[PDB]
Amino acid sequence: QSMKIAVIGQSLFGQEVYCHLRKEGHEVVGVFTVPDKDGKADPLGLEAEKDGVPVFKYSRWRAKGQALPDVVAKYQALGAELNVLPFCSQFIPMEIISAPRHGSIIYHPSLLPRHRGASAINWTLIHGDKKGGFSIFWADDGLDTGDLLLQKECEVLPDDTVSTLYNRFLFPEGIKGMVQAVRLIAEGKAPRLPQPEEGATYEGIQKKETAKINWDQPAEAIHNWIRGNDKVPGAWTEACEQKLTFFNSTLNTSGLVPEGDALPIPGAHRPGVVTKAGLILFGNDDKMLLVKNIQLEDGKMILASNFFK
């Protein structure tokens, strides 16, 4: 009923799940989160520090092919009965996952078995999926193969980005879903729903490097690529001697015409055009998409229409 929980996670999502668990009467025995980065502490770590809950910060969890003995010891002192992984950027070693009585439950922002692995919201959108959602699932010895506890779906809209889909649904409903899952576990009523084999896909973490734009694709695929990396890590290309990151794409180009200032883009099927509406780009089908914002290599964010000032 009133459980000793280890929270392994990060970000405001992790903070909120932490706060709710405390409000429901559970004891958070410890929090494992990410290091400060940079000069900025993780908000879940800061909140737990306010409360005097143990807080441990790690980027890597392993050495010599095993869980870090340091982390195992710190973890074993806590006596956790359940692990909750609200927003966890990596896979946690099996030695920690399998330790508690009640097991480990994990939030994953896609409709498992679709998009197993990291960056699942990015891959949802990169593939132009028409539905998306999140799962809370029981960790097993596999990679995001564990039985579901609950799953909630939402419609994906044609210009949705990682940030808009997260803020509209996966964040607010996902927090609610994790909290509901813990309540069911506390009550001894949590479902176990084995994942079907049909439709399983896997992708790994999407770092800035692999967000580089492939121009040899139809406009619709390039639009899905840009929005599926917006805002993090940010789809990019090299143009005008710098690395430019593109945000806020749309395929609504009704009434637009390709007149303005050329933006030559090595490797693209046609040059981009800077217009009053934004940056017009062409896919390899000579169809257009429109990018409204550009982030310069130095980090400055601009309206694409203002690129040449």
d(CA 49, CA 31): 9
Neighbours of 183 (CB within 10 A): 15
Which domain range does residue 246 map to?
208-309
Our measurement of the distance from residue 127's CA atom to the centroid of its chain's CA atoms, rounded to an integer in Å, reads: 15
The string of DSSP codes covering 227-290 is HTTTTTT--EEEETTEEEEEEEEES--TT----SEEE--TT-SS-EEEETTEEEEE-TTS-EEE
The answer on 10 and 120 residing in a single domain is yes
108 is catalytic: yes
d(CA 184, CA 198): 27
The pair of structure tokens assigned to 139 is 């960790």
- Is 92 a known ligand-binding residue? yes
CB-based contact 48:18 (threshold 8 Å): yes
CB-based contact 289:256 (threshold 8 Å): no
Q: Looking at beta carbons, which pairs linking 157-161 to residues 24 or more positions away fall under 8 Å? A: 158/251, 159/227, 159/249, 159/250, 159/251, 159/252, 160/125, 160/227, 161/125, 161/227, 161/228, 161/230, 161/231, 161/247, 161/248
Asked which of 165, 185, 207 is the last residue of a domain, the reply is 207
Question: HSE-up of 226 (CA within 13 Å, CB side)?
Answer: 29
One-letter amino acid identity for 124? T
- Give Dmax (Cα) for the chain: 66
Cis peptide, bond prior to residue 38, ω within 30 of zero: yes
- Is 144 a known ligand-binding residue? yes
d(CA 162, CA 154): 14
- Is 91 a known ligand-binding residue? yes
Number of domains comprising the chain: 2
CATH number at residue 278: 3.10.25.10
Asked which of 177, 207, 237 is the last residue of a domain, the reply is 207
SS3 143: coil
- Is 242 a known ligand-binding residue? no
d(CA 302, CA 309): 10
The answer on 160 and 30 residing in a single domain is yes
Catalytic residue among 108, 115, 127, 223: 108
CB-based contact 31:11 (threshold 8 Å): no
The answer on 26 and 71 residing in a single domain is yes
The answer on 244 and 103 residing in a single domain is no
The answer on 222 and 113 residing in a single domain is no
**Solved how?**
X-ray
CB-based contact 281:263 (threshold 8 Å): no
The pair of structure tokens assigned to 146 is 């564990």
DSSP designation for 193: B
CATH number at residue 202: 3.40.50.170
Asked which of 145, 180, 207 is the last residue of a domain, the reply is 207
**Which positions ≥6 away from 12 have C-beta within 8 Å?**
43, 44, 171
